[PDB]
Amino acid sequence: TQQVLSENQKLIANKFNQALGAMQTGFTTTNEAFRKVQDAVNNNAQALSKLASELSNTFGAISASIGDII
């Protein structure tokens, strides 16, 4: 029985290691994906903030420059 148990043990260890590699690939991929998500959300938040700042500043400018006419 000891021999069968050693062989079965070897199979356990092998499938275990394979699953280990699969999980490492998984978490690594998740990490890269979170990098891309962070950079995209950040870039689009930045562009949005630039847009709002431009609209507000320019509308204040026009408010003044047309205010002076009267």
């Binding site: 499938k15 699953a19 699969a22 998740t30 994906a33 950079d39 870039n43 562009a47």
Partner: protein, 31 residues
């Protein structure tokens, strides 16, 4: 100089499906 950028995870999700396949490949029958 900034502009609107898009987000592409199709490769990463492909890797995730690959990983769940290599997880399905480690199931142990009793025997």
């Amino acid at each position: 100089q900034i502009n609107v950028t898009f987000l592409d995870l199709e490769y990463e999700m492909k890797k995730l499906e690959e990983a769940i396949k290599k997880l399905e490949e480690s199931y142990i029958d009793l025997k």
